[PDB]
């Protein structure tokens, strides 16, 4: 009924309203792109590169000594390092920008090393519904701010099509958990396995 450290989670935005998310390529095209999952009945959405786990949730005063020199459930006003599941590297803000408008906004990417000057994200509530210090209920509208560049990660619209950016403009998001503490040696969704019985292959036109 809450969020939880070491949970595979997935970002979701909604803006011509649809259901969008954040997948990353990894090992080439480190700039993050966006994908829609509003149309599951006729087409599968490739969500297997869209899952993020949670590693650290600690207060915005606690990490300064960490930059100087296991289940902690998370609250608002904390700071979060979240990593990519498949490509194994961490999400981060960046320095350059491909905005091509001088719109004073960086663009997110991915980073290998966790030397956390810039790969930390802080949490914020939406309105006067909830407030600072309360816990994070499942399925909530959040606002994510970088610690370093102090921008909001927002959905860009006016530049033709739509993609993510990092500017001063509020944008709600979501958590929508897809996994938890699994059991010993069972099967769950999203995994990869074999199909013995001497197996079930496909060929090296290969249909």
């Amino acid at each position: 009924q809450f969020l939880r450290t070491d949970d595979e989670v997935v970002l979701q935005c909604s803006a011509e309203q649809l259901k969008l998310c954040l997948a990353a390529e990894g090992f080439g095209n480190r700039l993050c792109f966006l994908e829609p999952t509003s149309n599951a009945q006729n087409v599968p959405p490739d969500l297997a590169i869209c899952c993020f786990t949670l590693e650290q949730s600690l207060s915005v005063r606690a990490l300064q000594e960490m930059l100087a020199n296991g289940h902690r459930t998370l609250l608002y006003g904390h700071a979060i390092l979240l990593r990519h599941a498949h490509s194994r590297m961490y999400l981060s803000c960046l320095t350059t920008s491909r905005s091509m408008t001088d719109k004073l906004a960086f663009d997110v990417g991915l980073q290998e090393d966790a030397t956390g000057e810039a790969c930390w994200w802080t949490m914020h509530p939406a309105s006067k519904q909830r407030s600072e210090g309360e816990k994070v209920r499942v399925g909530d509208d959040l606002i994510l701010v970088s610690v370093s560049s102090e921008r909001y990660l927002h959905l860009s619209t006016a530049s033709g099509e739509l993609q993510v950016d990092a500017s001063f403009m509020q944008t709600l998001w979501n958590m929508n958990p897809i996994c938890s503490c699994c059991e010993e040696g069972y099967v769950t969704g999203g995994h990869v396995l074999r199909l013995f019985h001497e197996c079930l292959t496909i060929s090296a036109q290969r249909r």
Partner: protein, 49 residues
């Protein structure tokens, strides 16, 4: 042309002092990071010329 001129000088004198850059205090070189990001350097050359 006096409003934008008197906007910059407070952004000028809110830049941190140089002896707080020899010490790498994370605010004093991230305040400079945001303040360098807002107005580019080449646009400053166009005004002074």
């Amino acid at each position: 042309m006096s409003f934008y001129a008197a906007l910059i000088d407070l952004l000028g004198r809110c830049a941190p002092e140089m002896h707080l850059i020899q010490a790498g205090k994370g605010e004093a070189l991230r305040i400079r990071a945001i303040l360098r990001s807002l107005v580019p350097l080449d646009d400053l050359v166009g005004i002074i010329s």
